[PDB]
Amino acid sequence: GDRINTVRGPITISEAGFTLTHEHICGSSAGFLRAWPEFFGSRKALAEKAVRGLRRARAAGVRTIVDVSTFDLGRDVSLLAEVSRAADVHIVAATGLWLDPPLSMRLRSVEELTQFFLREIQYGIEDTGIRAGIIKVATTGKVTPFQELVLRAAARASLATGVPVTTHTAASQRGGEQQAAIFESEGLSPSRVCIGHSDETDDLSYLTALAARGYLIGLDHIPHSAIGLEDNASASAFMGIRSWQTRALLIKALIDQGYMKQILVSNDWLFGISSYVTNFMDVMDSVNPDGMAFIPLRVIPFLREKGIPQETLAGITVTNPARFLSPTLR
Amino acid sequence: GDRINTVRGPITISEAGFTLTHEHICGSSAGFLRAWPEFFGSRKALAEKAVRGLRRARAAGVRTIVDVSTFDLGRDVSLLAEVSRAADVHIVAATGLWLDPPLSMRLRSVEELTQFFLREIQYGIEDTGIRAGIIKVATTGKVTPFQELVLRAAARASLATGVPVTTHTAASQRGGEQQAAIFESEGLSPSRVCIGHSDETDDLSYLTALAARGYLIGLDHIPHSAIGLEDNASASAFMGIRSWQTRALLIKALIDQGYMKQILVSNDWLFGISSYVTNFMDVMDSVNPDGMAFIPLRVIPFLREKGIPQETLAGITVTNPARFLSPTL
Ligand SMILES: C[As](C)(=O)[O-]
Ligand SMILES: C[As](C)(=O)[O-]
Ligand SMILES: [Zn+2]
Ligand SMILES: [Zn+2]
Ligand SMILES: [Zn+2]
Ligand SMILES: [Zn+2]
């Protein structure tokens, strides 16, 4: 229709504006923020940092972010709603499952997972009445049996509600190809789907092929370059040796192939992280001081210097997310 | 000290009475009860089932249960408080980690885990002000490197606060021997430690040796048995095919060996479970309609028929848990 669900309620599509389609307020685990807030210093501290971060993104032109933190990424929608009001930035919340599902999720059938996702979309998250506006899923190269169940549950929940699906992929392993095959076996329209972390490869033919089938290509790891850390056993597996300009030029390459309409760009940033090593957040902030403002402050100007016109950069950052997020059954 | 943290606040040891030492209101995962309460019908239905079940247990003489649900078993201490108050049964809450820690736990140092356990003990669980009176940990046969971190954190937390440590084990793999060695390397007295699920084995030499070192022995799976349900694979992989009377006779055994002061007895029951197959709660309730009342309604009289004196049984169900739960530094 004409309305997108956010943590503050429904908004009309024209209100979304410049939208970052793959972000996080906090990368954690289910129940963790509540049970151990001092891991982040304090809940208040984490919130205040996130509010400053969003206001900084807002002053760079960002109007909406999509928080693709799932249940098992320890999504706290109450936190999302708080920081959204204070920063005057729309936040779309996610259902789905990422890569750390607990036992109570891992043992569920595709039918039960479908019910969980649908409840979070149609009824609300926890007892908050806040509804998800996107379904997030994740696979590791060769899709596992449980992951296949997740993707099919996501497909079915999308098909009943018209909300889009967005994925975590290992692009180096061409992971989107198995994701796409599963989605298509369920009769899901590719234009409901973003294949994420896609800038983690130099294989353009892989990307272009997905695009040509109608998938959105999520180029969301541009500031995850991490230059110089090939000794750090934490910042050499996580992140690599590909410059942000190298990644960003994939955006240009896809535009030149005629697939500007299939491109989504983001940062995959956050303001706290507990799912990795202690103080990884300091590592990330040191390497990307712009945080969520990296896309509008660096990547957009870079693309302009490379001769990408304003109307195209507007289509990618405003029109493309809008079309993606608006619930549609085609 | 002679006071124990419960979910309704501190009680004196005298108040605990008949204490079921290894139980669960709900077996789940972190965040799960609050994200998907309809899995249990509703949160309300779950609380009311648990109030009914505890009330029957209270009728049968139980005054206190120990809920050894950790963070990663989806312990919702607000649920525990509600059902405790409504059934007027004491509940002691747990910190620690079970076998399903998430990345945010799995990636933590022993120093960090120590601080988390201390927080739930000294400050409170989440923002509730409810403090754990016990530390629950779990290993699987061979202790994993992360599981070793958890047990050392548990020991350090215990030595700082005096609260006891209860464990989950595979008695088939004599899991308690590995746990004990880790605990003792940290300087922890065995009198601060219960080795649980010890009734899954019939190896008395394993039990008595542990007992002789001063460890508490948790014979807590007594009502678990999938006899007549052998063609249901999920039932006999979770409950086994050993009679409850056989499990119970292990209690007599340790008494006869002179070890009554080391026995703790329980049902390891619960009123909802999401951390196993769907509708498994109905299979459990089918096997044991008595729920947490199985121990005082069936087991305790069974032991008296086999000639065990009343005072010894009272020492096991009252005195031993009191001594165990009392913060002893
Ligand atoms: C929260 As992530 C680093 O798996 O996109
Ligand atoms: C939570 As259990 C059934 O492993 O004691
Ligand atoms: Zn991801
Ligand atoms: Zn992400
Ligand atoms: Zn157990
Ligand atoms: Zn248990």
Tab-separated table of N, CA, C and O in Angstrom, chain A residues 132-184:
chain	number	residue	atom	x	y	z
A	132	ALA	N	7.274	-5.439	12.905
A	132	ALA	CA	8.417	-5.509	11.978
A	132	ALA	C	8.021	-5.076	10.562
A	132	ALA	O	6.896	-5.314	10.125
A	133	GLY	N	8.951	-4.446	9.845
A	133	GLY	CA	8.705	-4.003	8.486
A	133	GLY	C	9.649	-4.665	7.503
A	133	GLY	O	9.696	-4.285	6.342
A	134	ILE	N	10.419	-5.639	7.981
A	134	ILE	CA	11.360	-6.383	7.140
A	134	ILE	C	11.655	-7.714	7.801
A	134	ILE	O	11.552	-7.832	9.017
A	135	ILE	N	11.945	-8.729	6.985
A	135	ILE	CA	12.326	-10.045	7.458
A	135	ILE	C	13.807	-10.287	7.108
A	135	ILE	O	14.207	-10.219	5.940
A	136	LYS	N	14.621	-10.531	8.125
A	136	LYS	CA	16.056	-10.703	7.941
A	136	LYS	C	16.431	-12.181	8.116
A	136	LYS	O	16.001	-12.830	9.068
A	137	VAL	N	17.213	-12.709	7.188
A	137	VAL	CA	17.661	-14.078	7.295
A	137	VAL	C	19.157	-14.148	7.014
A	137	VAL	O	19.726	-13.226	6.465
A	138	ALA	N	19.789	-15.257	7.353
A	138	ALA	CA	21.232	-15.358	7.150
A	138	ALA	C	21.628	-16.795	6.831
A	138	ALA	O	21.072	-17.728	7.396
A	139	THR	N	22.569	-16.983	5.911
A	139	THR	CA	23.080	-18.328	5.659
A	139	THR	C	24.591	-18.301	5.618
A	139	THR	O	25.205	-17.248	5.469
A	140	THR	N	25.187	-19.475	5.775
A	140	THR	CA	26.629	-19.614	5.678
A	140	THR	C	27.021	-20.484	4.492
A	140	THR	O	27.028	-21.711	4.591
A	141	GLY	N	27.330	-19.831	3.369
A	141	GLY	CA	27.775	-20.500	2.156
A	141	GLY	C	26.825	-21.555	1.628
A	141	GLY	O	25.892	-21.253	0.880
A	142	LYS	N	27.087	-22.805	1.993
A	142	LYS	CA	26.136	-23.870	1.750
A	142	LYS	C	25.073	-23.782	2.850
A	142	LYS	O	25.366	-23.961	4.037
A	143	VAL	N	23.851	-23.472	2.446
A	143	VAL	CA	22.718	-23.346	3.364
A	143	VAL	C	22.542	-24.616	4.191
A	143	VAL	O	22.545	-25.712	3.651
A	144	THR	N	22.421	-24.460	5.504
A	144	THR	CA	22.193	-25.595	6.398
A	144	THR	C	20.725	-25.981	6.391
A	144	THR	O	19.886	-25.173	5.990
A	145	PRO	N	20.403	-27.210	6.842
A	145	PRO	CA	18.995	-27.609	6.913
A	145	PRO	C	18.126	-26.611	7.674
A	145	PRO	O	17.056	-26.250	7.165
A	146	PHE	N	18.583	-26.135	8.830
A	146	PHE	CA	17.788	-25.176	9.599
A	146	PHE	C	17.636	-23.843	8.882
A	146	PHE	O	16.551	-23.251	8.881
A	147	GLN	N	18.722	-23.370	8.272
A	147	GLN	CA	18.723	-22.127	7.520
A	147	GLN	C	17.737	-22.168	6.343
A	147	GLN	O	17.100	-21.169	6.037
A	148	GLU	N	17.637	-23.327	5.692
A	148	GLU	CA	16.684	-23.508	4.613
A	148	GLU	C	15.278	-23.329	5.142
A	148	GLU	O	14.489	-22.688	4.482
A	149	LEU	N	14.984	-23.917	6.312
A	149	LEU	CA	13.708	-23.726	7.031
A	149	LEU	C	13.415	-22.258	7.333
A	149	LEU	O	12.282	-21.790	7.167
A	150	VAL	N	14.436	-21.536	7.793
A	150	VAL	CA	14.312	-20.089	8.001
A	150	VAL	C	13.960	-19.352	6.698
A	150	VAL	O	13.084	-18.470	6.692
A	151	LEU	N	14.658	-19.668	5.611
A	151	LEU	CA	14.429	-18.927	4.376
A	151	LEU	C	13.008	-19.192	3.871
A	151	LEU	O	12.346	-18.293	3.399
A	152	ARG	N	12.541	-20.431	3.997
A	152	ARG	CA	11.213	-20.765	3.520
A	152	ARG	C	10.146	-20.106	4.391
A	152	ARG	O	9.170	-19.577	3.866
A	153	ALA	N	10.354	-20.119	5.706
A	153	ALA	CA	9.492	-19.384	6.636
A	153	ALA	C	9.469	-17.903	6.272
A	153	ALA	O	8.427	-17.281	6.277
A	154	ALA	N	10.629	-17.342	5.963
A	154	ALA	CA	10.665	-15.928	5.565
A	154	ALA	C	9.877	-15.698	4.285
A	154	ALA	O	9.130	-14.716	4.169
A	155	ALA	N	10.059	-16.590	3.315
A	155	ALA	CA	9.338	-16.485	2.055
A	155	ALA	C	7.833	-16.482	2.302
A	155	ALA	O	7.111	-15.631	1.792
A	156	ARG	N	7.378	-17.421	3.113
A	156	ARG	CA	5.948	-17.561	3.384
A	156	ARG	C	5.392	-16.351	4.142
A	156	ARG	O	4.323	-15.840	3.805
A	157	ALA	N	6.118	-15.867	5.148
A	157	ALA	CA	5.698	-14.661	5.879
A	157	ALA	C	5.623	-13.413	4.982
A	157	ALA	O	4.699	-12.593	5.115
A	158	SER	N	6.588	-13.266	4.076
A	158	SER	CA	6.586	-12.182	3.098
A	158	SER	C	5.391	-12.280	2.160
A	158	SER	O	4.706	-11.290	1.897
A	159	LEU	N	5.144	-13.489	1.668
A	159	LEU	CA	4.048	-13.748	0.755
A	159	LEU	C	2.693	-13.433	1.397
A	159	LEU	O	1.795	-12.973	0.711
A	160	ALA	N	2.548	-13.648	2.706
A	160	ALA	CA	1.282	-13.322	3.367
A	160	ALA	C	1.156	-11.840	3.732
A	160	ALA	O	0.049	-11.352	3.937
A	161	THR	N	2.270	-11.117	3.805
A	161	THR	CA	2.230	-9.739	4.304
A	161	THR	C	2.748	-8.672	3.351
A	161	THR	O	2.536	-7.480	3.573
A	162	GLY	N	3.472	-9.089	2.320
A	162	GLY	CA	4.090	-8.148	1.403
A	162	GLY	C	5.332	-7.442	1.928
A	162	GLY	O	5.896	-6.665	1.201
A	163	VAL	N	5.768	-7.690	3.172
A	163	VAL	CA	7.042	-7.115	3.639
A	163	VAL	C	8.241	-7.825	2.986
A	163	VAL	O	8.174	-9.024	2.685
A	164	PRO	N	9.341	-7.086	2.738
A	164	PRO	CA	10.489	-7.651	2.018
A	164	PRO	C	11.374	-8.511	2.895
A	164	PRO	O	11.283	-8.481	4.125
A	165	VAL	N	12.218	-9.283	2.234
A	165	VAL	CA	13.211	-10.112	2.870
A	165	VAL	C	14.616	-9.592	2.540
A	165	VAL	O	14.900	-9.215	1.404
A	166	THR	N	15.490	-9.567	3.544
A	166	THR	CA	16.860	-9.106	3.339
A	166	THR	C	17.817	-10.116	3.980
A	166	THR	O	17.507	-10.709	5.019
A	167	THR	N	18.957	-10.349	3.341
A	167	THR	CA	19.791	-11.474	3.750
A	167	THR	C	21.219	-11.087	4.101
A	167	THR	O	21.749	-10.081	3.632
A	168	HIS	N	21.796	-11.929	4.940
A	168	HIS	CA	23.212	-11.963	5.216
A	168	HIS	C	23.828	-13.058	4.381
A	168	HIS	O	23.366	-14.201	4.383
A	169	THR	N	24.902	-12.730	3.681
A	169	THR	CA	25.461	-13.676	2.738
A	169	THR	C	26.978	-13.693	2.866
A	169	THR	O	27.568	-12.713	3.322
A	170	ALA	N	27.605	-14.815	2.531
A	170	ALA	CA	29.033	-14.784	2.216
A	170	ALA	C	29.176	-14.627	0.705
A	170	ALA	O	28.993	-15.594	-0.044
A	171	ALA	N	29.469	-13.407	0.252
A	171	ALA	CA	29.455	-13.126	-1.182
A	171	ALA	C	30.624	-13.825	-1.881
A	171	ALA	O	30.526	-14.217	-3.053
A	172	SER	N	31.719	-13.999	-1.147
A	172	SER	CA	32.878	-14.737	-1.641
A	172	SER	C	32.528	-16.181	-2.001
A	172	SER	O	33.202	-16.804	-2.823
A	173	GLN	N	31.475	-16.708	-1.385
A	173	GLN	CA	31.021	-18.059	-1.672
A	173	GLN	C	29.781	-18.053	-2.560
A	173	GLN	O	29.084	-19.058	-2.667
A	174	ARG	N	29.501	-16.909	-3.169
A	174	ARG	CA	28.323	-16.738	-4.029
A	174	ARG	C	27.023	-17.191	-3.352
A	174	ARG	O	26.128	-17.745	-4.001
A	175	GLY	N	26.918	-16.925	-2.051
A	175	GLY	CA	25.811	-17.408	-1.230
A	175	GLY	C	24.412	-17.016	-1.681
A	175	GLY	O	23.450	-17.716	-1.390
A	176	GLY	N	24.291	-15.896	-2.381
A	176	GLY	CA	22.998	-15.434	-2.837
A	176	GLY	C	22.350	-16.409	-3.807
A	176	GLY	O	21.133	-16.476	-3.892
A	177	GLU	N	23.161	-17.187	-4.515
A	177	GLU	CA	22.632	-18.116	-5.513
A	177	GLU	C	21.766	-19.226	-4.891
A	177	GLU	O	20.686	-19.517	-5.394
A	178	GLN	N	22.231	-19.830	-3.804
A	178	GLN	CA	21.420	-20.802	-3.081
A	178	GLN	C	20.237	-20.123	-2.406
A	178	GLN	O	19.180	-20.727	-2.286
A	179	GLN	N	20.407	-18.871	-1.970
A	179	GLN	CA	19.304	-18.182	-1.279
A	179	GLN	C	18.191	-17.949	-2.289
A	179	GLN	O	17.019	-18.232	-2.022
A	180	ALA	N	18.587	-17.464	-3.463
A	180	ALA	CA	17.650	-17.172	-4.538
A	180	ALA	C	16.896	-18.420	-4.982
A	180	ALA	O	15.701	-18.369	-5.213
A	181	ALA	N	17.598	-19.545	-5.088
A	181	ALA	CA	16.964	-20.787	-5.516
A	181	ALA	C	15.897	-21.231	-4.514
A	181	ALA	O	14.799	-21.637	-4.897
A	182	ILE	N	16.206	-21.147	-3.227
A	182	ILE	CA	15.218	-21.492	-2.204
A	182	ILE	C	14.000	-20.553	-2.261
A	182	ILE	O	12.848	-21.011	-2.281
A	183	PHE	N	14.252	-19.248	-2.327
A	183	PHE	CA	13.180	-18.255	-2.431
A	183	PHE	C	12.272	-18.520	-3.632
A	183	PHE	O	11.033	-18.456	-3.547
A	184	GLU	N	12.898	-18.806	-4.762
A	184	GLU	CA	12.148	-19.023	-5.983
A	184	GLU	C	11.361	-20.323	-5.930
A	184	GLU	O	10.268	-20.385	-6.485
